[PDB]
Design a protein around this ligand. Structure first.
Ligand SMILES: [Zn+2]
Ligand SMILES: [Zn+2]
Length: 26
């Protein structure tokens, strides 16, 4: 959880949908 940082391949805040590499969608 705990939102995200760029270290995780996500902007701050996380994009949400828009290319977010944190969920089963590949
Ligand atoms: Zn992330
Ligand atoms: Zn993310």
């Amino acid at each position: 959880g705990s939102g995200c940082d760029d270290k995780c391949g996500c902007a701050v805040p996380c994009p949400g949908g828009t290319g977010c590499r944190c969920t089963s969608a590949r």
